[PDB]
Design a protein around this ligand. Structure first.
Ligand SMILES: Nc1ncnc2c1ncn2[C@@H]1O[C@H](COP(=O)(O)OP(=O)(O)O)[C@@H](O)[C@H]1O
Ligand SMILES: [Mg+2]
Ligand SMILES: [Mg+2]
Ligand SMILES: [Mg+2]
Length: 323
């Protein structure tokens, strides 16, 4: 169906609110004609000074350019009854990574992690190849269904990136805990590397079940990053002295990288990949394509993997986890 925007929201049965969204609520709902479960993201128009939100417009333009298994795919746009909000429509996903981790109902085996990472990275690689930067990777933006299928979501901060030559981009992107060192240090002409750093944080978080860098503020965050990955310095990161806040934001002692010691409990192949993902110099950081060729992922056959043990009776989304 090419003919978007005309079908009515009342063709869906609204089951319940699953999210609080930037420009409207997110609903679980059911298709009355097909019986299919969907998520509806509301876009409210009324009382907006500038009408339909430029934010949703950007996301819509990006979503429409991406078709991949591991990336959220918007089915149609529907309207409130007329004569007024729109609703973006997506395949319903039972959970997101944050809600699950927080539920305390789940445990992820090495095999589960491999499978999740394989799917996340293939989604990410696809986006990068299309010249999109995600810029908001975090647990709450990764969706998982009961069949154990992963989808990268929330393209609300994504943008096109110039692969041919460098361009200046917005710096305060990515929630702080997942934000890479070059951004904390004020880079504006950054790269798809920023997203891979976010993913290495997820990977580590899957093993410890807690976000691996948890600070309030930027300087504090850099210090925590320094403590694990080593201080940023020219010896490992020559270009670092060119960054705006390098002198201003300086860690507290000149730390050694102790990533491999701190995460020794992790399997060695996972740990290689983690090491590479959390490499401070974005130009040395592995690409999304590189992660897929790693020991940890290269031989993961998805068809041959058992779905994980996820609750089929509770939908573990981030909003739920708070309530
Ligand atoms: N297609 C979907 N299926 C199931 N749940 C979803 C879907 N899209 C979003 N959600 C839930 O709604 C929450 C908000 O969605 P999102 O796209 O992340 O908007 P935002 O973070 O900008 O408010 C997500 O954390 C997720 O838990
Ligand atoms: Mg989100
Ligand atoms: Mg968002
Ligand atoms: Mg590697």
């Amino acid at each position: 169906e090419s003919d978007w925007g005309k079908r009515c929201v009342d063709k869906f049965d609204i089951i319940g609110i699953i999210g609080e969204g930037t420009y409207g609520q997110v609903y679980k709902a059911k298709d009355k004609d097909t019986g299919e479960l969907v998520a509806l993201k509301k876009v409210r128009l009324d009382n907006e000074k500038e009408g339909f939100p430029i934010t949703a417009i950007r996301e819509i333009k990006i979503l429409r350019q991406l078709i991949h298994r591991s990336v959220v795919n918007m089915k149609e746009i529907v309207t409130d009854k007329q004569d007024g909000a729109f609703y973006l429509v997506f395949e319903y996903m039972d959970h997101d990574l944050m809600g699950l981790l927080e539920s305390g109902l789940v445990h992820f085996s090495e095999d589960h992690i491999k499978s999740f990472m394989k799917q996340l990275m293939e989604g990410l690689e696809y986006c990068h190849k299309k010249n999109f930067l995600h810029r908001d990777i975090k647990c709450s933006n990764i969706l998982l269904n009961n069949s154990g299928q992963i989808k990268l979501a929330d393209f609300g901060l994504a943008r096109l990136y110039n692969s041919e030559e460098s361009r200046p981009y917005t710096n305060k992107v990515i929630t702080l805990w997942y934000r890479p060192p070059e951004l904390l240090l004020g880079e504006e002409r950054y790269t798809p590397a920023i997203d891979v750093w976010s993913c290495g944080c997820i990977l580590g978080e899957l093993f410890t079940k807690k976000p691996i860098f948890q600070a309030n503020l930027e300087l504090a965050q850099l210090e925590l990053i320094s403590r694990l990955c080593g201080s940023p310095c020219p010896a490992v990161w020559p270009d670092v002295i060119k960054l705006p806040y390098f002198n201003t934001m300086k860690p507290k002692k000149q730390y050694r990288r102790r990533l491999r010691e701190e995460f020794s409990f992790i399997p060695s192949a996972a740990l290689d990949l983690l090491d590479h993902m959390l490499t401070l110099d974005p130009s040395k950081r592995c690409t999304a394509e590189q992660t897929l060729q790693s020991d940890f992922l290269k031989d993961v056959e998805l068809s041959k993997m058992a779905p994980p043990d996820l609750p089929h009776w509770q939908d573990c989304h981030e909003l739920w986890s708070k309530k």
